[PDB]
Design a protein around this ligand. Structure first.
Ligand SMILES: [Mg+2]
Ligand SMILES: [Mg+2]
Ligand SMILES: [Mg+2]
Ligand SMILES: [Mg+2]
Length: 328
RNA sequence: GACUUAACUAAAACCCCUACGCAUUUAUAUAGAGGAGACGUCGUAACAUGGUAAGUGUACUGGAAAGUGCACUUGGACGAAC
């Protein structure tokens, strides 16, 4: 979805001069406008140039204007990356996050995901997904896509996972898992909860919430159970986890507040009961695929509007600059 | 005597050098010169009308006290009837 964007509007097409200016600004320890950065981003037309731009971005991030790094600039950068290589450099930036200060909580992410899908690369995609999760996102319908990707990854990834990875997986499951419309979403959520529960029990409660959008409160297994029950009112992995748990420093929890390692048999029983109920009443990848096939009516008008707004803003900025020059 | 960047949150940047010299001031230490104070010689200057009454000022003079001039003082006296 490229040709809607490629009316960028014209500016200066000399990068060396811009670079020099930037250096001078930094030499003096003076601030830099966002506009210049945007222009720089626009200009790029080589891998060396891309590298240079990256550096410049980093510098900006470490300056009196850490903020003002506008969405539009980020978008432009992403586009540039896509045009050239994309899957190493953008990813790297995302990983760095705080240093390049890119924070593209937008359709950019979706685009990136799509690109990744187009040229296989699974690990990278997973990483991207994780990064997105770490950022507070998931108002848009890319959530489904993310979930699908996660599922795909899981379909390959079937070992002991390990500390960070399990947590990441759980996070991925959870935040995109807000799909009240279908039982698949609920299942995903449950799975996520189970993973998180496992993490809690093996290692610690702090291990779960430390860096993630996740909440300190102890009952994760309980929460999962509740969620499951909700569905009934209106899994294998979870069972396995439970079984494992059953099989044979500071304290955030209280003396009165009961320890969840000493609530296991009861929990297991509850789970069993729930399962029975489900059976009485009455694959994941397939479901996800089906979902994908349905739905997906896009956000293109909105995107266009946003672009227009950005353009307007740019124009305003230019005008301001002109005024300043006149004054000078 | 020298002197702007940035503005979807708001912020960053912003740093001059020149007077002290055996110039000033006061004091200490001095080649040497001059007093004052303290403890034999030459006169006899003053004290008695002190042997030319004393003394003041000023002048000149003389080993030294002092001598003399001019004008002042009684801290001199003139004996207190003819
Ligand atoms: Mg005599
Ligand atoms: Mg006589
Ligand atoms: Mg004579
Ligand atoms: Mg004669």
């Amino acid at each position: 979805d490229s040709h809607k964007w490629e009316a960028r509007e014209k500016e200066h097409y000399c990068l060396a001069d811009l670079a020099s200016l930037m250096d001078k600004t930094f030499e003096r320890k003076l601030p830099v406008s966002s506009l210049t950065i945007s222009r720089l981003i626009d200009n790029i037309s080589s891998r060396e140039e891309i590298d240079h731009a990256e550096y410049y971005l980093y510098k900006f991030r470490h300056s009196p204007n850490c903020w003002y790094l506008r969405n539009w600039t980020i978008h432009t950068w992403i586009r540039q990356c896509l045009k050239y290589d994309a899957q190493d450099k953008a990813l790297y930036t995302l990983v760095n996050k705080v240093q390049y200060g890119i924070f593209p909580d937008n359709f950019t992410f979706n685009l990136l995901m799509d690109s990744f899908i187009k040229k296989e690369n699974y690990k990278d995609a997973l990483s991207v997904v994780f990064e997105v999760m770490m950022q507070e996102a998931f108002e848009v319908p890319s959530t489904q896509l993310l979930s699908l990707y996660v599922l795909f990854h899981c379909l390959a990834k079937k070992t002991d996972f390990s500390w960070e990875e399990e947590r990441n997986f759980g996070a991925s499951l959870l935040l995109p898992g807000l799909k009240q419309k279908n039982s698949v979403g609920f299942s995903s959520q449950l799975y996520g909860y189970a993973l998180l529960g496992k993490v809690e029990l093996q290692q610690g409660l702090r291990a779960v919430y430390h860096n993630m959008p996740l909440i300190w409160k102890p009952g994760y297994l309980d929460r999962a159970l509740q969620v499951m029950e909700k569905v009934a009112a209106s899994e294998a992995l979870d069972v396995l986890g439970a079984v494992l748990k059953a099989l044979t420093k500071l304290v955030e929890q209280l003396d009165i507040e009961e320890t969840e390692q000493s609530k296991l048999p009861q929990y297991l029983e509850r789970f069993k009961a729930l399962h029975s109920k489900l059976q009485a009443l009455g694959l994941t990848t397939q479901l996800v695929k089906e979902k994908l096939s349905t739905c997906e009516a896009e956000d293109i008008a909105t995107y266009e509007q946003n672009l227009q707004q950005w353009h307007l803003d740019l124009v305003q900025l230019i005008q301001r600059e002109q005024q300043q020059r006149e004054q000078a």
